[PDB]
Amino acid sequence: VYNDGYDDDNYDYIVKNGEKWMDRYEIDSLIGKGSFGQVVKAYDRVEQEWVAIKIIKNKKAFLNQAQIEVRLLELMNKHDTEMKYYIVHLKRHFMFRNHLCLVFEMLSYNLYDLLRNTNFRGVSLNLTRKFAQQMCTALLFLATPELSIIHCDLKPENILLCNPKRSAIKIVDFGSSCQLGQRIYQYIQSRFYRSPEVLLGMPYDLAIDMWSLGCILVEMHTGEPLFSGANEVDQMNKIVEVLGIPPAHILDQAPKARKFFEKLPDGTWNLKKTKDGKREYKPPGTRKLHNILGVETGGPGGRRAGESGHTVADYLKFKDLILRMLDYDPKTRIQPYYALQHSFFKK
Ligand SMILES: NCC[C@H](C(=O)Nc1ccc2[nH]nc(NC(=O)c3ccccc3)c2c1)c1cccc(Cl)c1
Ligand SMILES: [Cl-]
């Protein structure tokens, strides 16, 4: 028996359709599972609305981290400006049957579900621009000095539509987030969206979220992850195919440089030597975003040829923004305020 029969063997609450909690919430059903717990849909009798309840796993390490999440959600939800409306709203939280429960405003499907719905053809450049703009505005809000919040797990599954037929989005899952100067983990971010500084074991700041955004925006237009590594070695090799070897000044300070690269007597770096015969990656920097995006050939896979809103000029602007978001140097990587001034967003 776990938690007196209330929990399964993975620390999760065994959800039961129709259950009424605290003479207030009427559980409709389980609507998602993840590493930190479950999200159920529930009707709130007192406020008379549908809400999403995240039931955190009944396990100390999960509980203690989720408490950092709550503090951050409360700090974001109360901070004064209107940019705060890109962040999901925590309505309240309580303990129930030894689980921490967070009650959220109801939202629709995530950006991954949207892509799946197009059969991974990708969404239009116009829709991509709308998501990009909203996300940069969310990132500008997190960068406001009082908050200085690093999300740490930006990816299509954590950006949700408010309404399934409309373009407005919100960011969820601050379960791994921290504030600048309160960093506690080293292996963070989903692998495909993971930044080079984290791969390399280096100190990291808010710039890691802009790296993830760049990866996300390409994926949303092409339908396909930009850097789809099966593990860390493979993830760094895939980044290198597109962007080249990272600059000497970063690798010279990187504790995990030698997991992926080796230093030559001249002071320059290469990828680590591999078995004779064993070709697997394109040579450094020869997989061009120019071709992935199909800038001059009708978009990703030619699928946008002779469509409105997908001109060569449009694509050149989009490509420039993306490369500025995928700068290897977290100190010169484009910051949210300047990204919003990019010609890609001109009216
Ligand atoms: N890294 C995944 C973060 C998600 C997540 O979707 N969290 C949400 C937070 C707040 C929220 N408010 N409304 C939501 N809507 C849905 O979950 C949903 C599901 C299916 C179809 C429409 C909407 C959601 C979802 C998640 C999913 C499953 C379990 C957890 Cl513990 C977290
Ligand atoms: Cl969440």
Author numbering: 135 to 481
Give me lines lifted from the publication on this model:
In DYRK1A, the ATP-mimetic inhibitor DJM2005 binds to the ATP binding site, forming three hydrogen bonds with the hinge backbone and an additional two hydrogen bonds from the inhibitor’s primary amine with the side chains of Asn292 and the DFG motif aspartate Asp307. There is also an electrostatic interaction via an ion (modeled as chloride) linking an inhibitor amide nitrogen to the backbone nitrogen of Asp307 from the DFG motif, and hydrogen bonding via a water molecule to the backbone carbonyl of Glu291. There are various favorable hydrophobic interactions with DYRK1A active site residues, including at the entrance to the ATP site, where the side chain of Tyr243 packs against the inhibitor’s phenyl ring. Interestingly, the inhibitor’s primary amine also interacts with a sulfate molecule from the DYRK1A crystallization buffer that is found in a similar location as an autophosphorylated serine residue in DYRK2 (pS159). In DYRK1A, this insert forms an elaborate subdomain of 40 residues comprising two short helices followed by an antiparallel β sheet that is conserved in vertebrate DYRK1 family members but not in Drosophila mnb. The second tyrosine of the YxY dual-phosphorylation motif (DYRK1A: Tyr321; DYRK2A: Tyr309) is the main mediator of a network of interactions that stabilize the active conformation, including with Arg325 and Arg328 (numbering for DYRK1A) that precede the APE motif, and with the backbone carbonyl of the catalytically important Gln323.
The dual-specificity tyrosine-phosphorylation-regulated kinases (DYRKs) are an evolutionarily conserved family of kinases with five human members (DYRK1A, DYRK1B, DYRK2, DYRK3, and DYRK4).
